[PDB]
Amino acid sequence: KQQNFCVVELLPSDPEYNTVASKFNQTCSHFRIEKIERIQNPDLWNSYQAKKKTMDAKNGQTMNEKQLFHGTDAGSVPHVNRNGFNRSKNAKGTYFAVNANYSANDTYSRPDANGRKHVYYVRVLTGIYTHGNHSLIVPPSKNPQNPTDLYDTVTDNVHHPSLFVAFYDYQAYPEYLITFRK
Amino acid sequence: KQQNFCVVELLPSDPEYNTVASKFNQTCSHFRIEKIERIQNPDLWNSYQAKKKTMDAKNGQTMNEKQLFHGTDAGSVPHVNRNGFNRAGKNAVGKGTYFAVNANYSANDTYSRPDANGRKHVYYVRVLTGIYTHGNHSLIVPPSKNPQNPTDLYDTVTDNVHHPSLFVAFYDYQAYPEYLITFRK
Ligand SMILES: NC(=O)c1ccc(Oc2cccc(C(=O)N3CCC(c4ccc(F)cc4)CC3)c2)cc1
Numbered sequence: 334k335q336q337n338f339c340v341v342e343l344l345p346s347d348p349e350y351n352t353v354a355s356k357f358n359q360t361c362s363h364f365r366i367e368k369i370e371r372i373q374n375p376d377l378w379n380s381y382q383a384k385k386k387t388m389d390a391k392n393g394q395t396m397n398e399k400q401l402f403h404g405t406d407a408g409s410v411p412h413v414n415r416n417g418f419n420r421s422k423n424a425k426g427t428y429f430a431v432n433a434n435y436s437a438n439d440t441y442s443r444p445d446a447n448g449r450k451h452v453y454y455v456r457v458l459t460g461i462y463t464h465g466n467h468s469l470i471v472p473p474s475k476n477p478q479n480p481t482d483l484y485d486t487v488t489d490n491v492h493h494p495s496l497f498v499a500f501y502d503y504q505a506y507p508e509y510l511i512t513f514r515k
Numbered sequence: 516k517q518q519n520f521c522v523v524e525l526l527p528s529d530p531e532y533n534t535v536a537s538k539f540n541q542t543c544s545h546f547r548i549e550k551i552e553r554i555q556n557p558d559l560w561n562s563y564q565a566k567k568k569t570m571d572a573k574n575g576q577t578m579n580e581k582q583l584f585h586g587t588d589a590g591s592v593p594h595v596n597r598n599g600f601n602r603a604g605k606n607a608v609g610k611g612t613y614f615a616v617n618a619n620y621s622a623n624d625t626y627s628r629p630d631a632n633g634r635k636h637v638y639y640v641r642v643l644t645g646i647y648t649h650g651n652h653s654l655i656v657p658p659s660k661n662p663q664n665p666t667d668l669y670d671t672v673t674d675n676v677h678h679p680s681l682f683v684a685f686y687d688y689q690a691y692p693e694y695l696i697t698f699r700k
């Protein structure tokens with residue numbers, strides 16, 4: 334699939350704009366939001382909703398999907414817009430933050446030559462997660478009897494998570510991109 | 516206008532792909548092209564074709580439009596895709612935008628700066644060069660053609676009026692960033 338995409342800027346009067354800016358300003362009010370855009374990539378979306386359908390049929394009552402933040406540099410934006418976060422420079426999976434302020438750190442959302450920072454608000458299939466360590470390239474197996482079944486994501490803390498690490502293709506859809514500055 | 520846009524990657528078999536890769540490799544054969552994309556921004560396009568329509572009505576037989584190269588950094592790409600080269604004055608200065616006849620001027624690391632992954636970005640741009648004169652890297656607007664009539668200024672300035680290698684444009688909607696070439700060394 335070609336995974337072409339369109340970039341739709343949301344109006345400040347839009348309900349989606351206020352929803353996204355609201356979650357971001359929970360921890361990043363001190364920044365100036367320049368624009369919020371929706372990434373419309375039908376192929377990437379279909380692939381994501383397909384893997385969500387499979388997970389929704391496997392985790393029973395689990396609310397598999399969460400909306401999390403991902404800071405990246407300006408160079409990565411056209412590449413995330415097209416390919417999602419597939420087959421990755423993270424921190425060998427992809428890191429997502431519960432709160433925007435982790436992603437607004439200059440190390441991740443590096444200011445570009447014009448001083449602009451980029452943080453995505455991502456639909457992520459966190460699924461069933463366990464505690465991780467920054468040295469896993471695949472998630473651990475749920476059952477030592479059945480190394481078949483691995484966890485979907487890993488986290489820093491299973492009961493009050495602040496970060497999740499995803500490892501599989503089409504596990505995240507970069508729905509909104511926030512461009513801001515200090 | 517919102518000036519939203521879509522980014523369509525051309526297939527290596529497309530007639531457009533090899534047309535564009537052909538113009539680029541005239542002077543940049545040593546690079547590897549990773550992908551060629553078409554920027555589809557209807558609002559920016561309509562605005563551009565309107566300003567081409569007026570210029571086509573003013574310069575008689577002049578072939579107003581040329582296809583030129585512009586290297587930029589990865590940070591600028593989402594901004595050019597939406598806004599074109601409209602309104603630091605952070606070009607090769609100066610209130611204008613620099614376009615190269617040949618891609619190798621734009622492929623210089625100073626303009627198409629390699630990003631963290633080593634990728635370089637050069638647009639193949641539709642530019643209304645129009646009627647141009649010689650420039651002197653110190654212009655905020657192009658000079659007026661006639662001192663009798665300071666109304667009508669030139670459309671662009673150039674390094675060489677008869678063998679141009681570079682153009683500077685100063686007005687809004689004078690350039691459309693039709694194709695984006697992503698490549699590496
Ligand atoms: N791009 C982003 O927006 C982004 C979003 C979230 C994000 O999480 C952070 C935030 C701050 C520091 C770190 C950090 O390096 N470690 C955290 C503590 C340790 C650890 C915890 C959990 C693990 F599973 C593995 C290791 C060591 C590594 C990670 C990073 C980037």
Ligand SMILES: NC(=O)c1ccc(Oc2cccc(C(=O)N3CCC(c4ccc(F)cc4)CC3)c2)cc1
Pocket residue numbers: 584585586587607608613614615620621622626627649650651652672673674675681683
């Ligand atoms: N972004 C780009 O892809 C890009 C495309 C083309 C481009 O042209 C170049 C290439 C090499 C040097 C220069 C340069 O600084 N001057 C050129 C020589 C002099 C000059 C002559 C005529 C003029 F009207 C103005 C100035 C002094 C300044 C500019 C730069 C960037």
